[PDB]
Design a protein around this ligand. Structure first.
Ligand code: FEC
Ligand code: FEC
Ligand code: FEC
Ligand code: FEC
Ligand code: FEC
Ligand code: NA
Ligand code: NA
Ligand code: NA
Ligand code: NA
Ligand code: NA
Lengths: 237, 248, 233, 235, 250
C-alpha cells in the first residue's frame, strides 16, 4: 500500500529575523567586520556548490515572519549540521534571530538516470522569487489519504501532476519529504520570476481533489532573490 | 477553479510601541526620530502621488497592536524595500512587530467585472480603480484574514463552480447593501501568507463592521465555509494624531 | 438585530515585581500618585455619565489586574488606553491579554439605557471569558432557522433569570472587533455563583451544542486601599 | 449540582538559575530566610484549619516547582499569591503555568466525612500528578447533551475504577467551570508514580473518558520538604 | 473495554537545549574551558551510573532551530531523574543551554503481544524482558524523537475499540517494525500520566533515511493511518566527547 521514494540532498530552510535595534547599536566598523566574516562563509559555501557537493541560496522574506531565508542542501545530515553550527557561530548570527526552520530530503515519489540526479541533487534556479510552505496529507474521518487504496491515490496524484506540468516554464518546484524529519510530511519550495504564479498554481491545486480533500498546510513564506549587492544593502543603515 | 485579476501587493504591518524604552529618550532625540519618520512618510506620499502605490496608518485598539501601517505597491521588490527601509528607521526600534499580513488586491471571476470580449480588463478604468485602490480616509479600519473550509461535508474547494458562484453571488448582495457605509479591499493570499484572503474594511461608523460581518455570518458562504483569524480594529491617524500619540 | 451601547476594553496586566522592587520608595510613591490622578480622571468621566470603569485583582498567573473600561466611542477608548500606557507605572504593568467589544442588546428608554450603558456594580468578584457559537458540521448555529435559534436563546434566558440577585452579566458583542463573538463579564459577591451559572448553562442546548469558550479570568474587587496594598513591597 | 470546599491554586515556577547564580551566598541566604518565614506563616494557616499547602519538584522543563495552596476564600488565596510574588526570591521563580479551581463534590457540610473531602488534608506522598481536563462537546460525543441517567451511569463506572486504586492513589478533584480554562483540575498523590500511569490508562479505556475526556498538559513531581528545598537552591 | 496492561522500566528524560551563542561568545577562553571541564565531570558521573547498570544516557546534536542538543537520560526512579536534571541545570554551562522542549516517559512493554512464555515466571526475572525495559543505548549515528497519542475522535476512537481489535492493529504494526530489524532500533516510552502525549518514541539508526522509510510505511498501516496523532519530530547526529568540544569552539 505504502509509497516508496528515492531520496537525495538533505535540506535546511533557515528563517531569520534581523535584530535591527541591536545591529544599529553596533559601531559601523564592527558591522563591516561581521559582514566580511559572513562573506567568507558564503564564499566557502560557493566552493561546495561548484564542486557539486551541495547547493544554497538566500532570499529576503516579506512580512514579519523573517527578513531572510538561507536554503541549504548537503549530501548528509552531518554536513548539514556542520553548516548550521558554523553559521550560528558567525559573529553576525547573534543578530539573526531564529524564527522558523524546516528539515527535509529531496524526494522522488514512486506513484544514475541523469534525469533522476537532476531532480535528486537539484541545481537551484536563480529566479526572482521563492515561496516555501510545509504540508501534510489529512487523516481526518472520511478524508483519510493513508487509508485510501493505492489505485485511488495513484489516480489523485496523476491529476495533481497534470496541473503542475502546465506550470513548467513558469514555476520550478523542489519537493522535500520530511516524514521522520520535521513536523509536516513535505516541505514545498517554489521558484518563479512572477510571484503571482505561486498564487496561480497553489490556487489551481487547491481545487483538485488531491489537495481539496487531503492537503493540510502550514505557514507560507515568500521572498526575493538576494545576491551580494542586495545582501550588503539589506544590512546598511 | 477560480481565476483572478491581481493588483497591488499589500503589507499590513502591525506594531506595538515600547513605551518604556521611548520614555528613556530625551525629547530632543525623540523629535529627531519623529522627524526621520515624517521624511519617510513624505517619501511614501510621493510614491502614492506618482501612482505607484498607496499607504495609510491607523491606531489599533487593545494590546494586539498600537499601530498598523498598511502599504500597497506595484511589486514585491518595492514592498520589500519599503519594509526594510522602515525597519531601519531609528524609531522602528520602538515599534515592536506583533503581526503582519501579505496579500495582493484580488478580483475573482465568480462574477463579471467588465463586458466580456477580447478587450483586456487591465485597460478598463473601472477595473483598475478596484485593482489599484485609492484608500479612503474613513475614521475606522477593520482587518482580519480568512480561509474557506475544507472540512468533511463543508468543503468549499470540492464544490462545483456553479455552486460556488451562487454562494458568492448571495454574499455579494449583502455586501452591496452596505454601499456608502463600508468599503472593502479583498487581498488574495493563497501562496503568500497563512490564510487565503486578507479582508480590510473601512467605515466612518465602527458599528457597521459588526453589522456587515454579523449579517454575512448568517449567509451560507460564511456560515458554512468561513474560517477566521484574528480581528483588528482601529482609528485613522494623520500627522496631528501621530506626534500626539508619541508625546509621553 | 442588536442595539449597541458603550465600547468596552478589558485590559489584563501582570506586574513586573522584579523591576518594581528596584525602585526606591519615593519614586514608587510618585508613580502611584500619578496613577491615582489618572483613576480620579476616570471617575470624573463616570460621574458625568460618559463611561464606566472598574479594577479587579486576578487570580493565577494570567494577570495580576484587569482594568475594565467603557466609553461612548472607539476614539475615547483608544485615548484612555494610550494615556494609560504613558503613565510611568504602566512600564511595570505588562500586557497579558485584552478584549474589545460593544455592549449588546438583541434608545430613548431608561431600562434599555440602563442595559446599554451599564453601571458597574461594586461586587466582590468578577468573571470574564469570551465565546463564539460553533459552525461545526451538524452543530452550526449560523445555519439554524430563525425560529430554532429563538427557542434556544429563550431557554438560556430562563436560567439567567433564576440567578437574579446572585449574578449580574454584561454581554459585549465583538464580531468585527475581536477574535471571538462575545465578551461575557459576570459580577457576584459569591464566586461560586460563577461556577453554578456557567455549569447550568453548559447543560442547556444553546451552550451544550453551540458554545465555544476562550480563557476564563476570575478576580476580586480592588478599591484604592487594596490598590496601595497590592503595590507595597 | 456540587458541594464546594477550599479554593485552590496550582502555581508552577521555573528557577532562573543564571540569575540566582549571580547572587552572592549571603544574599541567597537572606532570600531563602524570607521564604522560610513565609512558609512558616503558611504552616500556621494549615495548623489552624484555614487552608493547606504543599510543594513538589516537577520533572522536565515545564517547571522546577509547584506550589499547591488551598484557602477558604478567593481573597485569602489572592493574598497568598501576591505576598509570594513580592518575596525577593520570587524574582528568580518564573511563572510557567497556573490553575485555579475549587474542591468539588458532585451528587452524581456538617458531616465529618464530607468535610474531610471538601477541606482535604494533603497526604505527604512521594509523588504528585496534576492535569486539567474538560468533557467533550463534539458531534455525537457530547457529554452535556447526554440524559442525566446516562451520565449517572458513566460516572458510576468511572468511580468503580477509582475505588480499586484505594490505598494507592489519593485524588483531589477541583471544579474550574467559571474559574479557569478547563472544567476540572485533577491532582493525584501516590508513593508509586507508576500508579498514575496505571489509573489514568485504565480510566482512558472506560467510556466516560474514552469518549468524553479532553486533557490538558500533565505535570509530575516529587515531594519537597525543608531538607530538599534548601538543596534544590544550593548551586 | 479491557485496558492495556504494561511492564515499565527506566524513567526517561528527553532534554532539548538551544545554545546561547551570543552569550557564550562573550566568555573568555579560560572561563569557557572551566565550564567545559565541569561539564565533562558531570558527564563522567553519568557514565559511572551507566557502568554500574543504574541508568543510561546519550547526547545527539539536533538539526534545525528546535534545538542544538538533546540529552536523553534514563534512570531507575523519578527521584534520580529529577536529581540529574537539577544538577545539570546548576552547571555553569547550563546558563548557555536554553530549554526548548522536554519529554518525560517510562520504558514500556504492553501486553498486546507476549514478551515471554506464560509459564508462571516473574517477567522481571526474564533477562530478555530486562534487556527491553532497561535498554542499552546503541551508538547509532542518528536519533529520531517524536511523541504521539491515539485518537479519540468520532468513529476513529482507539480507546473504544475491543481488546482483540486493538491487538490485531498492534500485531500488524509490529510486523512492519519487525521488518526494520537491524536497521532501526526503537524505544517506546509510555507517558500517560507523565507528559502531554501518550508515548514518546525514540528511533536509532545509522541511516537517517530509515527513519523516513519506517515512519512512512507505518503511516499506511491502519494502526497509525487511522489512530495516530503526532507531535513534533526531532532528528540528530551522535555527539561524543570530541564532537562536543568542537560544537562549543568558536
Ligand atoms: C510538475 C509539478 C509541479 C509544478 C511545478 C513545475 O512546473 O514543475 C508540482 C507542484 C506541486 C505543488 C505546488 C505542491 C503542493 C501544493 C498542494 O496543494 O499540495 C505539490 C505537492 C506534491 N507533489 Fe507535485 N506539487 N508532484 C509532481 C509534479 C508536480 N508537482 C509529480 C510528477 C509528483 C510525483 C508523484 C509520484 O510519482 O509519486 C509530485 C508529487 C507531489 C507530492 C507527493 C505526494 C505523495 O507522495 O503522496 C506532493 C505533496
Ligand atoms: C460588496 C461587498 C462587500 C461590502 C462592503 C462594500 O460594499 O464595500 C463585501 C464585504 C466582505 C466582507 C466583510 C467579507 C469577509 C467575510 C465574512 O465576514 O464572512 C468578505 C469576504 C470575501 N469577499 Fe466580499 N467580503 N466580495 C464581494 C462583494 C463584497 N464583499 C464580491 C463582489 C466578491 C467577488 C470578488 C470581486 O468582486 O472582486 C467578494 C469576494 C470576497 C471573498 C473572496 C471569496 C472567494 O474568492 O472565494 C471573501 C473572503
Ligand atoms: C438573564 C441572563 C443572564 C444571567 C445574569 C442575570 O442574573 O441576569 C445571562 C448570562 C449569560 C452568560 C453567563 C453567558 C455566557 C456563557 C454561555 O454558556 O453562553 C451568556 C451568553 C449570552 N447571552 Fe445571556 N449569557 N442573555 C440573556 C439573558 C441572560 N444571560 C438574554 C435575555 C439574551 C438576549 C440578548 C440580550 O439581551 O443580551 C442573552 C444573550 C446572550 C448571548 C447572545 C447570543 C446570540 O445573540 O446569539 C450570549 C452569547
Ligand atoms: C474513587 C475515585 C478515584 C481514585 C483515587 C482514589 O482511590 O482516591 C477517582 C479518580 C479520578 C481521576 C484519576 C480522574 C481524571 C482522569 C480521567 O480520565 O478523567 C477523575 C475524574 C473525575 N472524577 Fe473521579 N477521577 N470521581 C469519583 C471517584 C473517584 N475518582 C467519584 C465518587 C466522583 C463523584 C463524586 C460525587 O458524586 O460526590 C468522581 C468525580 C469525578 C469527576 C467529575 C465529573 C463530572 O462531574 O462530570 C471527574 C472529571
Ligand atoms: C518491532 C517494532 C518496531 C521497529 C523499529 C525499531 O525496531 O526501531 C517499532 C517501531 C515503531 C515506530 C517507528 C513507532 C511510531 C509510530 C508511527 O510513527 O506511526 C511505533 C509506535 C508504537 N509502537 Fe512500535 N513503533 N511496537 C512494537 C513493535 C515495533 N515498533 C511492539 C511489539 C509493540 C507492543 C509491545 C509488545 O507487546 O511487545 C509496539 C508498540 C508501539 C506503541 C504503543 C502502542 C499501544 O500500546 O497502543 C506505539 C505508539
Ligand atoms: Na520580512
Ligand atoms: Na492598542
Ligand atoms: Na494573579
Ligand atoms: Na523540572
Ligand atoms: Na539545531
Amino acid at each position: 500500500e505504502a509509497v516508496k521514494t528515492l531520496d537525495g540532498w538533505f535540506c535546511l530552510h533557515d528563517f531569520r529575523s534581523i535584530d535591527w535595534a541591536a545591529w544599529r547599536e553596533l559601531n559601523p566598523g564592527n558591522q563591516e567586520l561581521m559582514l566580511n566574516e559572513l562573506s567568507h562563509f558564503l564564499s566557502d559555501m560557493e566552493i561546495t556548490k561548484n564542486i557539486g557537493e551541495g547547493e544554497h541560496t538566500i532570499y529576503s522574506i516579506l512580512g514579519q515572519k523573517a527578513d531572510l531565508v538561507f536554503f541549504t542542501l548537503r549530501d548528509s545530515l552531518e554536513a548539514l549540521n556542520e553548516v548550521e553550527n558554523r553559521f550560528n557561530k558567525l559573529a553576525i548570527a547573534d543578530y539573526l534571530l531564529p524564527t522558523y526552520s524546516y528539515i527535509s530530503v529531496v524526494e522522488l515519489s514512486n506513484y544514475q538516470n541523469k534525469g533522476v540526479r537532476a531532480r535528486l541533487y537539484p541545481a537551484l534556479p536563480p529566479k526572482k522569487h521563492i515561496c516555501f510552505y510545509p504540508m501534510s496529507k489529512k487523516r481526518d474521518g472520511a478524508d483519510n489519504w493513508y487509508m485510501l487504496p493505492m489505485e485511488e491515490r495513484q489516480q489523485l496524484i496523476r491529476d495533481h501532476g497534470l496541473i503542475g506540468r502546465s506550470y513548467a516554464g513558469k514555476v520550478q518546484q523542489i519537493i522535500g519529504g520530511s516524514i521522520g524529519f520535521d513536523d509536516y510530511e513535505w516541505g514545498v519550495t517554489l521558484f518563479s520570476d512572477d510571484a503571482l504564479e505561486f498564487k496561480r498554481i497553489v490556487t489551481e491545486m487547491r481545487f483538485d481533489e488531491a489537495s481539496a480533500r487531503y492537503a493540510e498546510f502550514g505557514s507560507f513564506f515568500i521572498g526575493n532573490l538576494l545576491l551580494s549587492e542586495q545582501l550588503s544593502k539589506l544590512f546598511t543603515i
